[PDB]
Structures are given as C-alpha cells and as structure tokens.
Design a protein around this ligand. Structure first.
Ligand SMILES: *[C@@H]1O[C@H](CO)[C@@H](O)[C@H](O)[C@H]1NC(C)=O
Ligand SMILES: *[C@@H]1O[C@H](CO)[C@@H](O)[C@H](O)[C@H]1NC(C)=O
Lengths: 42, 48, 43
C-alpha cells in the first residue's frame, strides 16, 4: 500500500556501464495500479 | 457509545457490503458499485 | 519532451486514478479521478 520512486541522471541502444539509483519520495497510495500511461509535451 | 450514536429514526449514513466479487487485499479500498454475477447471464446495469 | 506519468485501472472518473506531472519548475503529484481521453497531451 505504498509507492516508491527512484531516480538517476547521467550525461550521454542503452549504454555500456553500471550505475545505481537513489530514492526520492515514498507515497501512501491505497489504490492498486495495473495500467500506466506516459505524457509528453509537443 | 450506544446512546450518542443512535436515534429513534436510526442512522442510514453508514454503508456496508452484503457481498462482493472477490476478497480485498490488505490495505486496499474499493468504492465500485459493480454487482457480482450470481445469475447465469449478466444483467447489464439493471437490478434484476 | 517527455514529462510525467498517469496510473490507474480504468483511467477515468469511474474509478480512482493517479497522475504525476512535471512542468520544468516543480513536480505535481495528485491522485484524483480526472478525465483521460483517448490520448492526453500538452500544447
Ligand atoms: C485491483 O486489482 C483487481 C484485480 O487485478 C482489479 O479488478 C481492481 O479493479 C483493482 N482495483 C482498482 C481500485 O482498480
Ligand atoms: C506548473 O508549475 C506550477 C509551479 O510554478 C504549478 O503550480 C502548476 O500546478 C503546474 N501545472 C500543473 C498542470 O500541475
């Protein structure tokens, strides 16, 4: 019954390398999620 | 509190579920009003 | 170009849905049954 988000940024076909991801924020959400959609501004 | 949460007319505010399609997972909430299909064929949104 | 995601089951007002959006100055997180059409987008 939560929601956790991790982020990472790196300058410059996924690249060859190893990198780790840090948490940002945890959210108490009581509704299960089965489908998700992205958004892009044109 | 038997006296402080009752009246001669009664309380119609509280709502509970007689039956439902499937069990609820721990810490999950559902307010959908969909009727479980107890009959052979669905009723398509009308209480039959 | 890409900013934000939406989450849910039916993705409409009928049931609960999630919506996270960024607009280059902050992050807005909000769990409400907003009206999603066939393909939402931003001008
Ligand atoms: C939770 O999951 C079940 C089965 O995957 C689904 O039927 C139900 O709609 C989900 N809950 C919500 C609030 O959408
Ligand atoms: C756009 O960013 C501002 C912050 O200046 C925020 O208040 C606003 O809610 C954002 N837009 C949307 C649609 O969330």
């Amino acid at each position: 019954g939560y929601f956790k988000i991790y982020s990472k940024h790196t300058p410059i076909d996924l690249p060859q390398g190893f990198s780790a991801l840090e948490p940002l924020v945890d959210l108490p959400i009581g509704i299960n999620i089965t489908r998700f959609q992205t958004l892009l501004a044109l | 509190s038997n006296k402080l949460d009752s009246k001669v007319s009664g309380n119609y505010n509280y709502l509970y579920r007689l039956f439902r399609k499937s069990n609820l997972k721990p810490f999950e909430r559902d307010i959908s009003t969909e009727i479980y299909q107890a009959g052979n064929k669905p009723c398509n949104g009308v209480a039959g | 170009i890409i900013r934000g995601w939406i989450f849910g089951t039916t993705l409409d007002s009928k049931t609960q849905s999630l919506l996270i959006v960024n607009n280059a100055t902050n992050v807005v997180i909000k769990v409400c049954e907003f009206q999603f059409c066939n393909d939402p987008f931003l001008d």
